[PDB]
Design a protein around this nucleic acid. Structure first.
Ligand SMILES: [K+]
Ligand SMILES: [K+]
Ligand SMILES: [K+]
Ligand SMILES: [K+]
Ligand SMILES: [K+]
Ligand SMILES: [K+]
Ligand SMILES: [K+]
Ligand SMILES: [K+]
Ligand SMILES: [Mg+2]
Ligand SMILES: [Mg+2]
Ligand SMILES: [Mg+2]
Ligand SMILES: [Mg+2]
Ligand SMILES: [Mg+2]
Ligand SMILES: [Mg+2]
Ligand SMILES: [Mg+2]
Ligand SMILES: [Mg+2]
Ligand SMILES: [Mg+2]
Ligand SMILES: [Mg+2]
Ligand SMILES: [Mg+2]
Ligand SMILES: [Mg+2]
Ligand SMILES: [Mg+2]
Ligand SMILES: [Mg+2]
Ligand SMILES: [Mg+2]
Ligand SMILES: [Mg+2]
Ligand SMILES: [Mg+2]
Ligand SMILES: [Mg+2]
Ligand SMILES: [Mg+2]
Ligand SMILES: [Mg+2]
Ligand SMILES: [Mg+2]
Ligand SMILES: [Mg+2]
Ligand SMILES: [Mg+2]
Ligand SMILES: [Mg+2]
Ligand SMILES: [Mg+2]
Ligand SMILES: [Mg+2]
Ligand SMILES: [Mg+2]
Ligand SMILES: [Mg+2]
Ligand SMILES: [Mg+2]
Ligand SMILES: [Mg+2]
Ligand SMILES: [Mg+2]
Ligand SMILES: [Mg+2]
Ligand SMILES: [Mg+2]
Ligand SMILES: [Mg+2]
Ligand SMILES: [Mg+2]
Ligand SMILES: [Mg+2]
Ligand SMILES: [Mg+2]
Ligand SMILES: [Mg+2]
Ligand SMILES: [Mg+2]
Ligand SMILES: [Mg+2]
Ligand SMILES: [Mg+2]
Ligand SMILES: [Mg+2]
Ligand SMILES: [Mg+2]
Ligand SMILES: [Mg+2]
Ligand SMILES: [Mg+2]
Ligand SMILES: [Mg+2]
Ligand SMILES: [Mg+2]
Ligand SMILES: [Mg+2]
Ligand SMILES: [Mg+2]
Ligand SMILES: [Mg+2]
Ligand SMILES: [Mg+2]
Ligand SMILES: [Mg+2]
Ligand SMILES: [Mg+2]
Ligand SMILES: [Mg+2]
Ligand SMILES: [Mg+2]
Ligand SMILES: [Mg+2]
Ligand SMILES: [Mg+2]
Ligand SMILES: [Mg+2]
Ligand SMILES: [Mg+2]
Ligand SMILES: [Mg+2]
Ligand SMILES: [Mg+2]
Ligand SMILES: [Mg+2]
Ligand SMILES: [Mg+2]
Ligand SMILES: [Mg+2]
Lengths: 61, 209, 56, 114, 123, 118, 14
RNA sequence: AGGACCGAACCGACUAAUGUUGAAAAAUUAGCGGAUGACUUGUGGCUGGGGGUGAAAGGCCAAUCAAACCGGGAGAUAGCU
RNA sequence: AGCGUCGAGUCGGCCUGCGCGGAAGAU
RNA sequence: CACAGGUGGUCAGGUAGAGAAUACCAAGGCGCUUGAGAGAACUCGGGUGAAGGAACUAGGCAAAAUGGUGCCGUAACUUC
RNA sequence: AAUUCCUUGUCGGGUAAGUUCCGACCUGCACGAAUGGCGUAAUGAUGGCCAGGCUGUCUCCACCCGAGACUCAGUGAAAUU
RNA sequence: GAUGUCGGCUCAUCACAUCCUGGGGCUGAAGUAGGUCCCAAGGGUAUGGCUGUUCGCCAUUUAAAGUGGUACGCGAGCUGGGUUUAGAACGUCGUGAGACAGUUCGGUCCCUAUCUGCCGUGGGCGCUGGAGAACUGAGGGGGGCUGCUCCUAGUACGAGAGGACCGGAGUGGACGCAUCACUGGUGUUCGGGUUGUCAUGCCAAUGGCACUGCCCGGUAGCUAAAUGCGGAAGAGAUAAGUGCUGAAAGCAUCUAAGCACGAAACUUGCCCCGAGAUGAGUUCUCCCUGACCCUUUAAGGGUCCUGAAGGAACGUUGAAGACGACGACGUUGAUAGGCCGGGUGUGUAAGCGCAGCGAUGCGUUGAGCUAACCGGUACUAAUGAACCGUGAGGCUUAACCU
């Protein structure tokens, strides 16, 4: 359920998503949009960006 | 096999030489007199009917007096039956004493539990009481919800509700035989047995031991 | 809670089938006065089992 | 009634000394520690007595190693071996539960001389 | 009869002075722990210089309770306070080297023979 | 549950019952016969008859005990001078209860309670 | 809780 | 001396419980705030409806207030039930 | 096929009718 | 409504008490217009409670707890 | 922050464990100087957090005292259909 | 012309796509510990910190802390923290009234149950003469959980470290049923201390009220935290799986003919209800062995006489109970009350005497009082009676006896 901007109302939908990378353990969650598919897409972009940062930090060592 | 009918006298303690205190129940098992022996031909099953105690002559009805007259025994306070195991035979008028339990190690005691009357759900089924504060309104020991909004839209059979508690047949199994006093017609068993003082108890050899 | 349909006179009579009174089976007769009275109760004149228990 | 009376009176000790609440008594008990069997002493003030024939019991309070310990002895239990009244106390109650909140000069009990 | 949130006093020179029970170990939905039962404790008060410090999660064994223990003859031994001895979280052995106050025979086990030996009195 | 219990509440508290029975005991001793409800008469037997056993022996301590339980010197004087000697030989059954029907205002079972020697 | 007219609470779906 | 302090009468109404076809169309019980002041109260008088009054809540104006009540226009109008 | 022997069929592919498994849900 | 509501002034006994508080009484008035039984669940108003002591809960809600006089003694801060 | 969406921002304190609280940072979606800014002793039936004592709030309920509920006699409704 | 929502509490019920326990195949399965798949729903399946939270993170447990349906189960069962009714403020938008899937403080939760359903408990009739008991068992319900330690055995296995299968004992957690012998709670019906006031003329001694005035103990009963017991063993038929013999198909093959195994699942075994089981069952015992008259002349009606066994009613009552019901008694009687004795609890009553100026102390004295307890007692109340309930119990066909 969308805890932010709608977590108060009696009727709550499973629009909020949380994508957790199984190997690394990095958690990512999006609740901005009312559609779970759009929230999944946004979380996918953020999680992939974080993984991009991980490889960059490996180079930055 | 078969058992005996006795009376609940009370509870006491037995001190052993090693300091262990054993809570025991005193059961008065006097002579049980056989009134009728049933066979597979006339009755279809093998059992014996026994009586114990004494009853007033002015209160023993004529049909009961005739039944005891045919048996040849004196009238008792009731009639009970015990199923006969294979290779076990008794005769009408034979008297069975508490010595039957001389070699019996564990017994099962059957009696009528003390009647609690109409009891609530909390007492009868160990239901949890609701909140006594925080705004509760007239609902402290109430049962609560008893079904669903629909499907089935009804209350299932066997729902745990309030009603009569106690005054029913209760059996306690595997009670150790502390002592068999043949001289005093006593049976001492470890633990507590259902019922109050003076109630009629049925003691049989243990089946699960 | 209230009814959804009007109960009938048939159901009303069935409910009242257990509301009938029971008359006294018999009345004891005193051995001295001869008056009728409830058993284990003194008579109107004040006699119980052949003795004037209360003086008027 | 009579049956239980006989069964209980045939197990009661006949060497029980007479003691009253407030009397300092010493009780010998069988430890049965391991294989050996020895007697351990427990001396303290009697604070409560329950007289129920065979089911009689008495409570003794003792300050041991800075800690207050209360022990309830069954009078006719075989584990209890001997009771000795070392001192007699002067009290006006059958129960002395007010001694549980007093220590030192406030827990002293006057001796019953006569 | 020690449940969660129950405050106990230490009976050893481990440095603590007051501890609180946070979990009664030994099964599921277990409610109370008597004399001789291992519990999970936290340290609330401690001496300025000791082996343990405030806010440490350890294990302990109860040695004294106000509810008391019951003997086979029906006797009961009741203390005036709830006391426990701190134990190492892994080896489950006493941390201190001294035991203060009497203990009971319920601790006469192979696991707590050290506590029995160090105890002043065993009643 | 009231297993093995004695005592009728009679829709009253302890103070009202004690005051009512004390008044009823004094009335019964004074008149030697009174009419009251059957449940009250059955409970009155357990408070008046013990007051006549205490009156069988005359002493200052017994007189003060009776006064503490009745609070009427006339009743105490009658108990220790007349009812005492009258029931000295008799033991136990000092009173008799006779049912006398039902009351008019309410269907209350009534009865007469008196003294056996009357 | 708002009490509507006819003394009935306003427990409607909004 | 004090829009001072604690606390009765007196004036209010912060919490909980009961009641909510109520004892009561707003109360009872246990607590609660002020209690010499911008206090409280008796009697009489004045301000009238797009008006009054309001230490201001759209609050109150006879159990009725984002425009009181009564009679009239009036059988307003209703593509709605 | 079985272990030269052996002593009558055997080897699969195609088209077809009816069947089997794939087949787990809440009074 | 023979309605646990509202309604201004005047009088002001004894004991204990600072007191018109409070407890018990005096003069005076009253027992409140259905009663009698029994002593189930459950509801309401209360009393007590082993061991633990907020672990309950949105929240110490509600309960529990403190409570007078005299004396000693009393911190940060302060517009003193 | 009575203002911060991201956000349970990051660090520190408190707790065994703290989306609440306190002290900081400044990246202020979207503070800001009489629709006042920042502090402030005292005060508040004001909001949030913590501690001691206290306890049936709870682990987990048990018993008792009364008023109903139950039975008897008299009187005698209501929603709804 | 109204189907009240999130979360919490109480109470649940079903499904298996199984979290644990249970049985197996493969393993990159040495053992221990795992991975995957198959069968299996009998039982069980955490407490706290944060937050209104579901969820989530964290701390500490557990054999495990399953996944879902049931109006996202359950407000005529409770709550009202969130869901912005009406008040107020902040940021932001607008000139403004006002408004934000923003934030913050505050903010009335009704219903006496008619029918179905469910939990208990009765009345009527039936079961074919009536009555009193004891049973059989068609059917139904309850229960089914598991940890740890020890022995086998430091054995099998393993280079070592480590470390078993099978089998057998003990002791716990949770749950459930009983019971008051013990330890405790309660115990406004028992005893005592004490404050204020009033009263019994007064001292003394008592009683009323003040929450039982405040307390301190405590009988019986009830009761848990207290102590006894339980989950089973065994049997039958099987699931996955494992096989023997054996062709179709000279081989092979667990299967097509046959045979043997195989699990907390099923049926029993354990406990309880149970002949309205209208298919109304069985066994034992007890009671009734008159006459006459009409008729629409048959499973007919009526009159006189008779009234059995038993039941009902009434009273005393119960560790039975809302009312019914159930149990024990009713004078040939211990059913209840009282009385006697004892026990229990409380703690040395009143009066009197002595010492002290007095408060007060001491002696008589472990005194007095003592509820529900125990053993006895006919002193009181359970009255003779009366009422209901009848007079040998249908037809047909068989089998015997006569
Ligand atoms: K005030
Ligand atoms: K106008
Ligand atoms: K802002
Ligand atoms: K300023
Ligand atoms: K305020
Ligand atoms: K299952
Ligand atoms: K008791
Ligand atoms: K004296
Ligand atoms: Mg009963
Ligand atoms: Mg609860
Ligand atoms: Mg309400
Ligand atoms: Mg309530
Ligand atoms: Mg509902
Ligand atoms: Mg009726
Ligand atoms: Mg009785
Ligand atoms: Mg009444
Ligand atoms: Mg009083
Ligand atoms: Mg002022
Ligand atoms: Mg106002
Ligand atoms: Mg008030
Ligand atoms: Mg003030
Ligand atoms: Mg003031
Ligand atoms: Mg407004
Ligand atoms: Mg108005
Ligand atoms: Mg207008
Ligand atoms: Mg016109
Ligand atoms: Mg019109
Ligand atoms: Mg197919
Ligand atoms: Mg009136
Ligand atoms: Mg009035
Ligand atoms: Mg006034
Ligand atoms: Mg006053
Ligand atoms: Mg008065
Ligand atoms: Mg009651
Ligand atoms: Mg209550
Ligand atoms: Mg209280
Ligand atoms: Mg407590
Ligand atoms: Mg306590
Ligand atoms: Mg505390
Ligand atoms: Mg909490
Ligand atoms: Mg919680
Ligand atoms: Mg409060
Ligand atoms: Mg209070
Ligand atoms: Mg932090
Ligand atoms: Mg601004
Ligand atoms: Mg400002
Ligand atoms: Mg009536
Ligand atoms: Mg409609
Ligand atoms: Mg499956
Ligand atoms: Mg099944
Ligand atoms: Mg099974
Ligand atoms: Mg906290
Ligand atoms: Mg729902
Ligand atoms: Mg669900
Ligand atoms: Mg809800
Ligand atoms: Mg409601
Ligand atoms: Mg709210
Ligand atoms: Mg507004
Ligand atoms: Mg219906
Ligand atoms: Mg079952
Ligand atoms: Mg007990
Ligand atoms: Mg007893
Ligand atoms: Mg006690
Ligand atoms: Mg008393
Ligand atoms: Mg005096
Ligand atoms: Mg008075
Ligand atoms: Mg007491
Ligand atoms: Mg072959
Ligand atoms: Mg083969
Ligand atoms: Mg008697
Ligand atoms: Mg006295
Ligand atoms: Mg005595």
């Amino acid at each position: 359920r969308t805890s932010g901007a709608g977590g108060q109302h009696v009727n709550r939908t499973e629009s909020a998503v949380r994508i957790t990378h199984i190997p690394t353990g990095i958690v990512t969650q999006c609740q901005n949009d009312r559609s779970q598919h759009k929230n999944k897409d946004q979380a996918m972009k953020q999680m992939k960006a974080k993984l991009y940062e991980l490889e960059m930090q490996k180079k930055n060592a | 096999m078969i058992g005996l009918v006795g009376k609940k006298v009370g509870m006491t303690r037995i001190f052993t030489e090693d300091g262990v205190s054993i809570p025991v129940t005193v059961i008065e098992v006097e002579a049980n007199r056989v009134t009728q022996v049933k066979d597979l031909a006339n009755d279809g099953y093998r059992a014996i009917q026994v009586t114990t105690g004494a009853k007033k002559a002015n209160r023993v009805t004529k049909p009961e007096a005739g039944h005891f007259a045919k048996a040849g025994v004196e009238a008792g306070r009731g009639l009970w039956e015990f199923r006969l195991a294979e290779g076990e035979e008794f005769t009408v008028g034979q008297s069975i004493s508490v010595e039957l339990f001389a070699d019996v190690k564990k017994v099962d005691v059957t009696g009528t539990s003390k009647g609690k009357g109409f009891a609530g759900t909390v007492k009868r089924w160990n239901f949890r009481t609701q909140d006594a504060t925080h705004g509760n309104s007239l609902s402290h020991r109430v049962p609560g919800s008893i079904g669903q909004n629909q499907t089935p839209g009804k209350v299932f059979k066997g729902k745990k509700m309030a009603g009569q508690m106690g005054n029913e047949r209760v059996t306690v199994q595997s009670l150790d035989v502390v002592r068999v006093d043949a001289e005093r017609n006593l049976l001492l068993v470890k633990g507590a047995v259902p019922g109050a003082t003076g109630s009629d108890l049925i003691v049989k050899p243990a089946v699960k031991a | 809670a209230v009814q959804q349909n009007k109960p009938t006179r048939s159901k009303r009579g069935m409910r009242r089938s257990h509301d009938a009174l029971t008359a006294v089976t018999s009345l004891s007769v005193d051995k001295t006065s001869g008056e009728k009275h409830l058993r284990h109760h003194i008579t109107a004149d004040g006699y119980y089992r052949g003795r004037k228990v209360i003086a008027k | 009634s009579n049956i239980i009376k006989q069964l209980e009176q045939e197990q009661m000790k006949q060497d029980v000394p007479s003691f009253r609440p407030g009397d300092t008594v010493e009780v010998k008990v069988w430890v049965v520690e391991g294989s050996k069997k020895r007697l351990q002493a427990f001396e303290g003030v009697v604070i409560a007595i329950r007289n129920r024939g065979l089911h009689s019991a008495f409570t003794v309070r003792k300050i041991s190693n800075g800690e207050g310990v209360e022990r309830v002895f069954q009078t006719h239990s075989p584990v209890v071996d001997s009771i000795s009244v070392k001192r007699r106390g002067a009290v006006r109650k059958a129960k002395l539960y007010y001694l549980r909140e007093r220590t030192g000069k406030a827990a002293r009990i006057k001796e019953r001389l006569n | 009869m020690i449940q969660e949130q129950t405050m106990l006093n230490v009976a050893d020179n481990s440095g603590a002075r007051r501890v609180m029970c946070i979990k009664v170990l030994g099964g599921s939905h277990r409610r109370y722990a008597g004399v001789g039962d291992i519990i999970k404790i936290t340290i609330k008060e401690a001496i300025p210089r000791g082996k343990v410090k405030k806010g440490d999660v350890l294990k302990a064994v109860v040695v004294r309770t106000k509810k008391g223990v019951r003997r086979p003859d029906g006797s009961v031994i009741r203390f005036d306070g709830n006391a426990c001895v701190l134990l190492n979280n892994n080896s489950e052995q006493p941390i201190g080297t001294r035991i203060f106050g009497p203990v009971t025979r319920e601790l006469r086990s192979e696991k707590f023979m050290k506590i029995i030996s160090l105890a002043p009195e065993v009643l | 549950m009231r297993h093995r219990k004695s005592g009728r509440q009679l829709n009253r508290n302890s103070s009202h019952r004690q005051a009512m029975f004390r008044n009823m005991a004094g009335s019964l001793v004074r008149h030697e016969i009174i009419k009251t409800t059957l449940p009250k008469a059955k409970e009155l037997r357990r408070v008046v008859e013990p007051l006549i056993t205490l009156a069988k022996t005359d002493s200052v301590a017994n007189r003060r005990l009776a006064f503490a339980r009745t609070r009427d010197n006339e009743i105490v004087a009658k108990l220790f001078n007349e009812l005492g000697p009258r029931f000295a030989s008799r033991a136990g059954g000092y009173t008799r209860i006779l049912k006398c029907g039902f009351r008019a205002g309410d269907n209350a079972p009534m009865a007469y309670i008196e003294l056996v020697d009357r | 809780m708002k009490i509507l007219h006819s003394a009935i609470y306003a427990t409607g779906i909004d």
